[PDB]
Amino acid sequence: AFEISDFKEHAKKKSMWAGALNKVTISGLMGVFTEDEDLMALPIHRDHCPALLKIFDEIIVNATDHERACHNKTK
Amino acid sequence: KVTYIKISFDKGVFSCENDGPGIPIAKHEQASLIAKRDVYVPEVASCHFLAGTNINKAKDCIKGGTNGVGLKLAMVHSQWAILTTADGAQKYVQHINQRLDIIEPPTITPSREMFTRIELMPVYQELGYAEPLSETEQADLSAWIYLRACQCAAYVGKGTTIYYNDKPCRTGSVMALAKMYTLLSAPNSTIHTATIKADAKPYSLHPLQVAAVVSPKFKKFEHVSVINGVNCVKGEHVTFLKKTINEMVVKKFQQTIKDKNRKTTLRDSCSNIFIVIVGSIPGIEWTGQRKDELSIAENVFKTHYSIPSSFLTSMTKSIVDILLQSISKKDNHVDKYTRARNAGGKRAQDCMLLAAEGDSALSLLRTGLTLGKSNPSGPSFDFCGMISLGGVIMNACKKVTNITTDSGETIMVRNEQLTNNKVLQGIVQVLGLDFNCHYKTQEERAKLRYGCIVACVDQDLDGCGKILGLLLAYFHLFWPQ
Amino acid sequence: KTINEMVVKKFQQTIKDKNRKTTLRDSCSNIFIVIVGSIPGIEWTGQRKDELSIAENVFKTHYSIPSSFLTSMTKSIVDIL
DNA sequence: TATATGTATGTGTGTATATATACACATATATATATATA
């Protein structure tokens, strides 16, 4: 059967947008952990959802985009 | 079934045709409601983004397709394209031009054929190429497509022929693929093979075929993967094989080494490996439309798959051989050899090699070959070399074995002591001899570096009899011609 | 590649063996690098932006790595080599 | 799962064949290494 999808349902079903929509092994996955006033970058040896990290990432890069866009400006 | 996939690439035009059931020649209701005109299924399949039969993929589905996007990506990068598809009662021809801007109405006739063909001209100029393609661009693109077809031919089932520009594609096995990729770095090499099976459905329905070559002249680890038909370049299946091989390699390295302290990692384990992995994996996901990288939990393989131990053992053996060899290759890389001026060139067969017995003999011969005008009719270093026989030659007649193989031929395999003799290694490297040659024809007898070996030995009974007879016995036992 | 070319040069210099041939894996397997900044005109391989796409010559034509950094790096790496 | 059973290495003796290496000592020369100048 040939189906036509909209953006919404597509993005919920398809991994092409943000990565896998379930937990997979992400090679090089790191996080920052505090050990007595010291930041350490440590590996996270546990599967996680790439799309879940992407929704954080998309907003964060929108913010840093705005920062560059405004850095030579008045406001 | 699909019995063939014909791919062609000629004068810029690219074409692909398969012969299973065609795409349904039928009106698409919802697509027509959207378009407010009559739209058939092939037009949705080729012109409607996010549309296809894989929008709702099953967890067990091993098709590469998932997004309903790829075909329209082809159309959008086509100056012109032709979709032709027949279902056994009708044929359907639709032309899709100007990067999906002009979608001509289709033409539907009766036909009893059954097939699907996409034919198109890319926008080479818009994409950075010459118009028409240059000699180099054309040859590069043809080679790349030819490669992709070979990969299909290894992934596709056994009732399906893959054609490229009408010739069938040879490489129906991962061994064929391995040989193709290593024909230059490592011709005539050993191909480790494995069929990696799983015990639980759906994984047990899809064995992974694997072929690997292991060579000291491989500089880094390297894999070729066709997974679900996709030539992807990153995925935890590779890491599964890498880690398994490494664990075994570390175990046997610490076993075989009596140093017992050195610690090697995955780069040491795997940098001499080239692997081809071909097959289907259900339930995988990708990191984008390109499908460069598959996404999966590593434990899928730890739980379900097992690499056959014979393959692991073979691989570990080859790799640990290389490891110890690399540790002691610095002591292999000092013989006494005076090269003639014309050794190995255009007049190489005009040259002699005066193999003397020690170093005082070389003092005599170098005194003799330098009488420049006291001997105007004599020889000199323009066509004469020198080398030392190192005392007494080893014999090979007591240090070799004729072993009988299955085809009915006894091959003559040497000893590890005879192989590592520094004197005979010197004359083989100097003369350029080859052990598996026979030198029956003159076309083979002109591939050497000198024209004759000349034994300048002593005339006392020891040097005239013993080491000259052992030199004759060596040359008789390996090259009587 | 830049660090490797310098590392190979100084390795053959410092070594009096003068025959051994090392590649990029030998050169670089003891390196951890952080690179931060902006590059105009790049493209990606998908929405995720895991991989940027660019002609290598952009850097060969336009950018230069300061030699003091290259020298320091090559020194540390050849010490390990 | 123990058993043989035919494979392959491996020092060892006398009389031969052909080589290799560390150190001391005095003084003139050398080729690249180094400051600090800047």
Added chain:
DNA sequence: TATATATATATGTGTATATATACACACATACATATACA
């Protein structure tokens, strides 16, 4: 361009040592390749 290192070579008469190959055969150590099975 300069003043300054620290290592580096060669000569005669001395002080010390190392190592490859042939040749025969009784003997020692290492599998490994089957063959009943189990």
